[PDB]
Scaffold this active site. Structure first.
Site, PDB file in Angstrom:
ATOM      1  N   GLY D 255      -2.459   5.294   4.380  1.00  0.00           N
ATOM      2  CA  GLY D 255      -2.267   5.492   5.806  1.00  0.00           C
ATOM      3  C   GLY D 255      -1.452   4.380   6.427  1.00  0.00           C
ATOM      4  O   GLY D 255      -0.579   4.633   7.273  1.00  0.00           O
ATOM      5  N   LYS D 256      -1.720   3.140   6.013  1.00  0.00           N
ATOM      6  CA  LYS D 256      -1.004   2.006   6.593  1.00  0.00           C
ATOM      7  C   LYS D 256       0.469   2.070   6.227  1.00  0.00           C
ATOM      8  O   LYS D 256       1.331   1.777   7.044  1.00  0.00           O
ATOM      9  CB  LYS D 256      -1.612   0.669   6.159  1.00  0.00           C
ATOM     10  N   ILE D 257       0.754   2.475   4.996  1.00  0.00           N
ATOM     11  CA  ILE D 257       2.136   2.583   4.563  1.00  0.00           C
ATOM     12  C   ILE D 257       2.899   3.704   5.283  1.00  0.00           C
ATOM     13  O   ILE D 257       4.011   3.487   5.773  1.00  0.00           O
ATOM     14  CB  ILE D 257       2.218   2.792   3.061  1.00  0.00           C
ATOM     15  N   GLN D 258       2.314   4.898   5.332  1.00  0.00           N
ATOM     16  CA  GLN D 258       3.003   6.044   5.942  1.00  0.00           C
ATOM     17  C   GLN D 258       3.271   5.799   7.410  1.00  0.00           C
ATOM     18  O   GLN D 258       4.293   6.232   7.941  1.00  0.00           O
ATOM     19  CB  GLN D 258       2.214   7.343   5.759  1.00  0.00           C
ATOM     20  N   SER D 259       2.344   5.095   8.055  1.00  0.00           N
ATOM     21  CA  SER D 259       2.513   4.672   9.431  1.00  0.00           C
ATOM     22  C   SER D 259       3.788   3.844   9.590  1.00  0.00           C
ATOM     23  O   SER D 259       4.578   4.050  10.517  1.00  0.00           O
ATOM     24  CB  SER D 259       1.290   3.868   9.873  1.00  0.00           C
ATOM     25  N   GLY D 260       3.999   2.911   8.670  1.00  0.00           N
ATOM     26  CA  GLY D 260       5.194   2.091   8.720  1.00  0.00           C
ATOM     27  C   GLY D 260       6.459   2.884   8.439  1.00  0.00           C
ATOM     28  O   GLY D 260       7.499   2.648   9.047  1.00  0.00           O
ATOM     29  N   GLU D 275      -4.083   4.821  -8.710  1.00  0.00           N
ATOM     30  CA  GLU D 275      -5.101   5.453  -9.546  1.00  0.00           C
ATOM     31  C   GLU D 275      -6.477   5.182  -8.946  1.00  0.00           C
ATOM     32  O   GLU D 275      -6.845   4.024  -8.710  1.00  0.00           O
ATOM     33  CB  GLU D 275      -5.034   4.922 -10.986  1.00  0.00           C
ATOM     34  N   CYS D 309     -13.107   3.769 -13.779  1.00  0.00           N
ATOM     35  CA  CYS D 309     -12.507   4.906 -13.090  1.00  0.00           C
ATOM     36  C   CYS D 309     -12.877   6.235 -13.790  1.00  0.00           C
ATOM     37  O   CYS D 309     -13.017   7.271 -13.150  1.00  0.00           O
ATOM     38  CB  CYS D 309     -10.972   4.739 -13.075  1.00  0.00           C
TER      39      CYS D 309
END
Lengths: 486, 485, 486, 485
Positions: D255-260, D275, D309
């Protein structure tokens, strides 16, 4: 070009060639002791193309002996040199002898120029060139030191016994394949050509000799089929049958061989490499491009009078498309050289085939479960001419849907559209070399492709059904050397 | 390890296992209707290891029907999964069932532990693992658009008819190969095991089931060899014979099949895939390392009492080296499930034993033969025939060509200068394998070449004991055309 | 040949074709409820080629549903059969429908015959044939027994969600690529074609259906771009965007998708596969063959009115060669069917593009930092005609050196010869799909080739700048079986 | 061996290591300005292993600047030499630093020696060695003259922007992979390690430097996860995120990246390579080997306290086999850096411990859940939570889908005849891995196919715990034309 072909045709048309046996490199003529078979033009049977010398029992024994005597020097001739003979033969036939070979095949086997070219020039040359390539791959063996320290080589030896090649009339190229495949791999061959391809086959023999084939490596022994075959099969060194031809002839050969095997006539178990064709099918799905399926069916069924191992001879049509398909086909047929005659695409090979096909047509006229929808014309006054014929069967299991006629005769069964799946099932229940489906719907194509997987060796989608053997003529021998001393 | 093997041996020794038929995944016992074959320990023939149910004509028909009914679901089962069954079976035999399988093979087939391990563990596992690898290569076919624009695929289909596997006593691994090769390629199988390997073969069948083999894909039908074979070959869907065993049995099977073919009982021409072995040779050149040739010949001839398709049974020695070779050999032999003093192990059954006794006794009365070593036998406890070496005065004596399937070596001594002549005699006169012992490369090359038709596997300075998947499928090509006329 | 093309052009020119939606195999027309978009000829905008039905929200939901419903039967259709559909479509377009496809692309997208042929016949057919080849390689997986004894297979599954294809006007072939690449790999597709390629795109849809494409596998939903896109992106099963078109449209799509992602609308993370082109450059070094660079720049900039993702639109010239280059170019331009008009190489696609380019030209006339050196002619009286235009910028960072115009407009900056290195640096500092250097000196070529490695994905030496995706539409799944029991 | 390991353990146990930032090759300590994170031993949480310096906003800016400044000299360093650094690091860790690395991983991440060895020695070395091999293949591109006469080369360039590696506590090897994959391909890296693996990760950083990593190519910046991430993502040259860890953290980063991106702060569209693992399953068919399925499930679920994982955390059992499976499992569990009686090892920290306690306590109050085994916990010494098995009465209960990242197995028992139905339920309802235990090939095939979208790695009769280089480069083609117009 056309003039050179004309000149070749005129040569063979103007006198009868004396066709000898070729045994151990020597040409043996009748010399007032042997029978002579007149090979005539199927399009003009008054014309004698050749008088073919017929092999005696003695001749056959001599041919077998020649093959044994030539064997060691032949398989010890390096593969590079054995191959050169066959590549040279292919080039000679494609160039120097192109028009003679074309003319001999046209005149003797009743082919037009295009049919002749595809066969005796193109396909013939292709067999030789491609076998040399495949063989070169097979022989490319390098020795290897295994994980355990042993030092290993593998070699492909020829069969120990000789190869009997029995070739059909229908393709000059097939005779070349039958003799060339075993010979290339270091085998020696006794070869009985079809009586009705003697002219073209003899030419092929003389070309091989010109190309440098050593004496006795291949022996050309035309003669009475039963007499020659019985004597070849009498020899303890019989190693393999290489055959292409009818089912009934194959079955006879097979039983004769097995008879000898079980009663211990042979040094080894002979290998039997045969191809017989079958009752090949075209299956039309309601979604098919009808025009394309019609044209494909005409070519598949009637080209070269249906005298192909892969020829279509049974057709399955959906009811909702039958009239359109059939009326289209009948319109195209109705609207339609070594010799020809109006209403006929070309002749069948001989009187025996002609008479057989006449019976097929006349029997159909009297069968209430059959109906001739088109054609059935025939005329033997000049050549063996039988016209394109289309016969509707009332049930899909009528004998006409399974009996091989080897002629321009199509049997058609019409199935109700909704029973497409059932019709595939019926085909799967009841043996063919080739088969085709015409359809656009992928689910139907997938269904038939899967359902009919045992019903044909070659399956075609939206194409006529008319469109590794080297390893059968060798056996592997492994040598393994150990260096450790116990 | 030894404690675990001891336990499996004591288990099978304690009592007799009822070995049932396995037809469509169901175990069928004698049920007071069927005959039984008592499989006994060839080293201790009083000991009954198994009572083997014998298939009736109706059982055979049901086996054939089972194979037919399982066929479509089997060949449609993806190759990945068909393979997994065989890989799993190999692992189960190599681990979980290792000691039971060793014990069954040792006791039933008269093998010591080393012989059993190489056979029913190692070679058996190798067959399955290597066939899976080879088949995966075979099935690796991608579709291609040709030059002319047509769109082509090729696929390998199984045979349309069923496969009859007829397997020998001598290797448990060969039974695995005979059923496994066709099954892996999507074929179904009716399998008649050797009566005298029923215990190990039945264990193999049960492991295959545990590994996930679907019902009816392989059907286990021990029984009267004549009755079972006649009934299997009566079925119109007979597709192939896969056979390893004696020449005489193969010829009988061959004749029965061809009879059916010409008479028209089969829907297809059946494929015959057979291995019979032969009269395998060791040829010793005067330049040979003698000690090594002696030890190699002892191993090649006498291991597992000569009961191998590839076993050496004829020996050619040069005159100048024969005394040294033979005295070495005899010294070594002299120095040497059950066992008996003076013997390496038993032959498989009384019929073999009695044939070998006749061979030995006949040799004492033939002026052209001499027993140089051995010829001892005793059947009071097991079928024990000792290593036997018989000199023939003539290279074409019948003992140089008759297969005895036992620990009997026939030797011919040739004058040193006639080495080329003796090669010619071998070529002029049916062997799976042959070996030359020699240092001289010219002699090796001459023999290697002269004998190229005399053996399928040729060995240099090694004992003569040392593509089949394609016989169980056929290619089908599909070609699609896009151009409209 | 020329007559068959003429006949196709006349057919489409003489009436307006009703272009329907195609959803689940069914053709849906406006039926007095849906809007209709008139697709006109860019070379003759009074001519209505087609009236295109416009998809409603409901239609889009139905298209999405069709794609989901068709999915399982589609990816379970064997690759051999999925491929056959696309190869058949390529052959139908190359033969049966060649002239119709040519005419539709010429008329609708404003291409001459040669431009049309390279696009909608050649490149289109190439995409299908080459994707089948690459896919066949990808699917050629054999299982393997690993060193540890495990038994492994790998398989390529399609995306779980559906693929939304958004295709541009400029190449019929690109529409084929956008829908065909995902479909071939077992995906199903909702497809919104460009309004101004509706005729040719609809033809492509009908050809696929004739070739046997199953219903619902691809769904043809022309409509208002915002309305259709918003409804497609509302579905939880949206799996991927496959897009080619302008930067600004891509950015809008991107932001709409991410918005849904972060607020949890989607079952999976959608894949975004987009290509947008950029401001592509030609760089001329003083050592260049000037004539060749001029001709290459004309073709690179002006061919198809610069309406290519890879079109050249900025040019860097050394001062000592500027006059010669420019005077050569202006001489060639000055010396210089669906429709045409003198002084113009062809039309731009629509009025909106025309109006944009007019602004670009008129703005340049009033900018003291710009100078129009050639051209700037335009005429909309008949078609959307904008002439070749060359504008000199005073500084290399002027907006005209970076703003994409999507038209026949070249911006040129002249740098002093000794500052070649600096000019490369400037290009590297300031994103392009393609770039080219014209030069003979290898040290300069090497320098630029290296320096500009981040400035273009495709770099050309002495050639115009106009001249693996399958794996983006699958995901690998490994299966591993263990035989050892703990 | 044990004496050497004992020495490394006693070394790190004796006192606390000051772990600095590493920025442009310089070690930066707290210097009375920066915060510290005390990394403690999860098996003995009173013991402080390291005092970890925490990066300030300015430190982060300097790390980003260092990566930018090192970039050209790094990608121009020949691949042979870039590889040598990583091969050398693997060898140093495998030899010289083997015991220090084992000790750091054991003590810091709560692993026993076997778990540590497989991770921080074997898997770590394998990542570097295999990536070098894979990259060498990638870089093997020769120029070609095409048909049309043009002369073409293709090269792989690194990303233009920097890579932010955000690595988890659970495997030292995963940190190596996250920084190594991009760096090998000529990228530079800003790396925020997990606070609770700082000791082992710092050792990895120092080994890379000893192996010859140039300054600024990788920059080691532990710190407040929120503050560091926000400052890294503020930079216009952010090129990629390479992340392994929890779903919630990934979604926050995403979310933080797409916002930028949408707001236009980045020069390029950043690549996101992440992953997260998931709720991995074991499905047991009635035909399964039960003992093997039990042992596989114990290992798959409880090894390293389920902190993988790919760990199994949900189990589907058929009703007819459930009593036998579970009693076997419970019997086996019962039979079973620091340690505590009744526990296999600790979970990583108190926050995990407290979450797991809530999971267990909540299960005691839910009518649809029952703790069948375990549920014990004690935090007096280390973060110890014992193996716990909870039966859910509903297959879509939240405990069948919520990731707990701890030694907690949720089990659903299905009626035997509803095996196909239960597969459908798994398909209809986010897993990295899944496994089926079964002998029946039809069931295996059905599941293998039905579950094809339910897991990226699917296992048959094995626990569910059992191209990335191309994400860090882009292709650039050069084409030269020789024809002059």
């Amino acid at each position: 070009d056309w003039d050179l072909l004309r000149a070749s045709l005129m040569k063979f048309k103007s006198s009868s060639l004396e066709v000898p046996l070729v045994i151990n490199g020597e040409r043996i003529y009748d010399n007032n002791e042997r029978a002579l078979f007149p090979q005539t033009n199927p399009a003009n049977h008054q014309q004698v193309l050749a008088n073919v010398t017929q092999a005696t029992e003695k001749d056959v024994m001599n041919a077998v002996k020649a093959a044994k005597d030539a064997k060691k020097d032949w398989y010890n001739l390096p593969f590079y040199d054995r191959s050169a003979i066959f590549l040279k033969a292919a080039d000679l036939i494609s160039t120097k002898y192109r028009y003679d070979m074309l003319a001999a095949t046209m005149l003797g086997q009743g082919k037009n120029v295009y049919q002749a070219e595809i066969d005796c020039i193109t396909e013939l040359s292709d067999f030789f060139r491609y076998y040399v390539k495949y063989a070169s791959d097979l022989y490319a063996q390098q020795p290897v030191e295994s994980a355990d320290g042993t030092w290993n080589k593998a070699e492909y030896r020829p069969l120990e016994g000789f190869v009997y090649a029995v070739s059909p009339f229908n393709f000059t190229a097939i005779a070349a394949n039958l003799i060339g495949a075993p010979a290339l791999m270091g085998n020696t061959v006794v070869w009985k050509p079809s009586q009705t391809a003697a002219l073209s086959n003899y030419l092929l023999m003389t070309v091989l000799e010109e190309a440098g084939l050593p004496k006795g490596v291949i022996n050309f022994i035309p003669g009475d089929p039963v007499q020659v075959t019985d004597q070849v099969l009498a020899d303890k060194d019989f190693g393999a049958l290489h055959f292409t031809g009818s089912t009934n002839v194959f079955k006879s050969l097979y039983g004769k061989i097995q008879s000898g095997v079980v009663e211990g006539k042979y040094r080894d178990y002979p290998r039997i490499i045969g191809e017989t064709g079958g009752k090949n099918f075209h299956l039309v799905h309601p979604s098919a491009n009808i025009s394309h399926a019609v044209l494909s069916t005409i070519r598949g069924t009637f080209e070269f009078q249906g005298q192909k191992c892969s020829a279509a001879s049974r057709l399955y049509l959906p009811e909702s498309k039958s009239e359109e398909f059939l009326s289209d086909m009948f319109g195209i047929l109705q609207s339609q050289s070594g010799g020809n005659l109006r209403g006929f695409m070309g002749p069948v090979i001989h009187e025996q085939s002609f008479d057989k096909l006449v019976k097929v047509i006349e029997d159909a006229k009297k069968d209430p479960e059959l109906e001739i929808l088109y054609g059935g014309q025939y005329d033997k006054s000049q050549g063996w001419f039988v016209g394109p014929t289309v016969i509707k069967a009332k049930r899909p299991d009528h004998p006409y849907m399974s009996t091989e006629f080897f002629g321009p005769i199509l049997t058609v069964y019409e199935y109700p559209d909704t029973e497409f799946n059932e019709i595939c099932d019926i085909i799967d229940n009841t043996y063919a070399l080739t088969g085709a489906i015409f359809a656009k719907d992928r689910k139907a194509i997938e269904y038939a492709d899967e359902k009919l997987k045992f019903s044909a060796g070659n399956f075609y989608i939206n194409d006529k059904c008319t469109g590794n053997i080297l390893s059968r003529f060798v056996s592997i021998r492994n040598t393994k050397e150990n260096f450790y001393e116990l």
